[PDB]
């Protein structure tokens, strides 16, 4: 039978419901959740920019064949163990943002590994102070 | 903590901006 | 301390990490890819918007607190079971991309357990098909 | 049943649509 379209179809159809669970995520924000997640995909865009040769030179450290998954956490994760500046969470939250930007063809789960679980409760340690300091 | 030495540093060039 | 803002930057970097991973993918597929998503976007916010109070009286059965994870997908499959007609997967799809909708606050894995696997599979098959009843 | 009965309905419609 036709079959070379297969993996097509299954790849599409689970990016697409993805995009979907979270258009329906997004409606259900408040106004003032969506403001403040606003500022968020534009500060670390901001610092993607503007910092794109720096994080290439830390994106090639954690991307070879060597690493499990919780070593390239506590390598993220150490910069927030000593230092927990609200700023240094959103240049961690950028830089976890540009490593799941180039891993488009692995797994969503791989990625979700990596900033789920203790580095996003640590983000979210005082998480007012780092709403502050986003929000101006 | 080479990876960390590098997001504090990125942490207080951009604290020093907003 | 202040801690009545952790649960919100929690929650809305889940958000946006997941909506990251889906750039990263939507980045990584060739204009076909692309012009096919983007086909399978506009037939379901289509048959959604036509068949609103359709899939309304449809969801309610689905909604409420009775239900295993199983019965779901086995409701849904049901149509897939007899009927393999492309457009039969469509609307099974676009049904499958309401309720992602409604889920907004569940989990996005109580949504992809849904969709993943056996139904995935089950649409999948014969995707050529159901690419060329989609592209015109 | 009842769901996939709707389902191949909701097909059925939108198979002579297109």
Redesign the interface.
């Known amino acids: ?28 924000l408040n106004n003032y ?1 969506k403001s ?2 606003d500022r ?2 534009k500060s ?1 865009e901001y ?1 993607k920019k503007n ?1 794109e040769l ?1 994080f290439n030179s ?1 994106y090639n ?2 991307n070879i064949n060597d690493i499990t998954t919780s070593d390239i956490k506590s ?2 994760i ?2 927030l ?3 927990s ?1 609200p ?2 969470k ?8 540009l490593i ?6 692995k797994n ?1 789960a791989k ?2 590994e990596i ?2 679980n203790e580095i ?2 640590k ?9 502050d ?1 986003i929000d ?1 | 903590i080479w990876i960390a030495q590098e997001l504090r540093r990125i942490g207080d060039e951009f604290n020093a901006y907003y």
Chains 1, 3 share one sequence.
């Open positions: 039978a036709a079959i070379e379209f297969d993996e097509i179809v299954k790849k599409l159809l689970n990016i697409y419901i993805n995009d979907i669970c979270t258009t329906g995520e997004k409606r259900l959740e403040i997640l968020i995909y670390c610092i910092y720096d830390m450290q954690i390598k993220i150490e910069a163990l000593i230092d500046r700023s240094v959103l240049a961690t939250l950028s830089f976890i943002s799941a930007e180039k891993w488009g063809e969503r990625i979700m900033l789920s996003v409760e983000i979210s340690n005082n998480g007012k102070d780092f709403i300091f101006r």
